[PDB]
């Protein structure tokens, strides 16, 4: 068989007459997150659109955008500083951290049917 472009999607193996599927191997860009040469010399790298099963080699963290290496996941949310993607942002506490961005402080106004503020 062949794809919509002039490439083969499958083949028949000689000497056995067997059908073998074909899938292209992984590829993607590389990004470097830096707080600045005026602050530190540490970086974290992200291998876009690939999962941490394959290959600076410190930690592993799987997000919806790729495999992030060199940053530590944390739970408490803060205002976004460096956008990474899909709701994940990323120096604080002598390390590079990755968290989920926060939309703002939660506030509730006291609604009543005979009250007003002037």
């Amino acid at each position: 068989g062949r794809d919509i472009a002039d490439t083969t999607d499958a083949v028949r193996d000689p000497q056995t007459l067997e059908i073998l599927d074909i899938t292209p191997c992984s590829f993607g860009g590389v990004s470097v997150i830096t707080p600045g040469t005026n602050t530190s010399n540490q970086v974290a790298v992200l291998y876009q659109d690939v999962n941490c099963t394959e290959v600076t080699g410190s930690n592993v963290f799987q997000t919806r955008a790729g495999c992030l290496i060199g940053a530590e996941h944390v739970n408490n949310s803060y205002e976004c500083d460096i956008p990474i993607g899909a709701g994940i942002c990323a120096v604080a506490s002598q390390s590079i951290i990755a968290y989920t961005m926060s939309l703002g402080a939660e506030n509730s106004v006291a609604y009543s049917n005979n009250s007003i503020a002037i």
């Binding site: 919509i4 472009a5 002039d6 490439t7 292209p24 590829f27 993607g28 860009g29 876009q48 659109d49 919806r64 955008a65 956008p83 993607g85 899909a86 709701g87 961005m101 939309l103 703002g104 402080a105 939660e106 506030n107 509730s108 106004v109 006291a110 609604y111 009543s112 049917n113 005979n114 009250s115 007003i116 503020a117 002037i118």
Partner: protein
Amino acid sequence: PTNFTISVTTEILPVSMTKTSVDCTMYICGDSTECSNLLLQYGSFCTQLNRALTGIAVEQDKNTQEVFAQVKQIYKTPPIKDFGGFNFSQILPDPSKPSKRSPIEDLLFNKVTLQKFNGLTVLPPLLTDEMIAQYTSALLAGTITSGWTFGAGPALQIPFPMQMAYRFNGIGVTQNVLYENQKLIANQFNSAIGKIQDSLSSTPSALGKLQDVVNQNAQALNTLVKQLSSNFGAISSVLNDILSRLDPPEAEVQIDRLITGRLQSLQTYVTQQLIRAAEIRASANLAATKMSECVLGQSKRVDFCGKGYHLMSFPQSAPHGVVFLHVTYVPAQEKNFTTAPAICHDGKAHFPREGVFVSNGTHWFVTQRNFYEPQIITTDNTFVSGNCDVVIGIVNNTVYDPLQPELD
């Protein structure tokens, strides 16, 4: 007019497009060092395209953030819905759903219907759908509870019927009309917002503006991918066959033809994307302005936030766009009367303060312009100026004063 009707109309605006990116060297000739060397003789042609694609990809997030990030804090509605008879159940988020999306925007998300190639990738947006829904929920809660106050300073609470009385007064109709027709107005509001769900769910092609961009992007990508099988003059359209069958001293020409053809195709694609991105940016700016001027306040521009006299608006979210729900005021049933520009009493011409003189055939009254409400003519609603020989076409009548019956 002697009656009125409250109407609700929608409006659809696109905001953003998909963030795609194409790699020049991989697309033009991949996994081959015997073409990259020849390609390296052309300069920054494989850098400018990447720069432009990165620019549009960055611009899309700015579009989304400008449209939707308009609030400071995240407001929340009270647990008890005592809104004086008004019913907002169809636009407020539903707490029993896996995703806290209102029924109308749930139908909107389900109505519109939105693979792998070589060198082509798609990037995810920075803001998820849940965050956009949360932003719209905060906006809607703020406008329900505090009116337009939360757009200028701190939010100050006010009962909803009183806010609606203020908005009625803002178009030229006094508030006692609402205080006397509250139940009727609430029922009309509920029925009008109820019709919207059926109108959206049953009418085809109501969301064509948001499907057009998806179709155009998919078609452009498909054409770019299909262009890889053309010959452009070489003996074969695939690179490996010619590369592995002939000496490079002869294969140079065959490689060069493919190189120039594919470069031209990529340039055409990038230019088209740039023009479309500019168009989408203009639409996003319009949507941001409409949100700012119709949701956070009351607009007096004609036919900007609906057809009629504007009262309020409620936003909803949608894939790659926003949806507005304009609430307006329309007169219903009129009548015929006889008027006059002035009343001549005791040799002096009297003019009305607010309204127009009307007569039902025998007597003379004063009424406001947008609603029939006859009042007797006294000195507290008419101001005197001049004499009766200047103004053309005036009549005679008797103007009373409240002082005389009280002092006798």
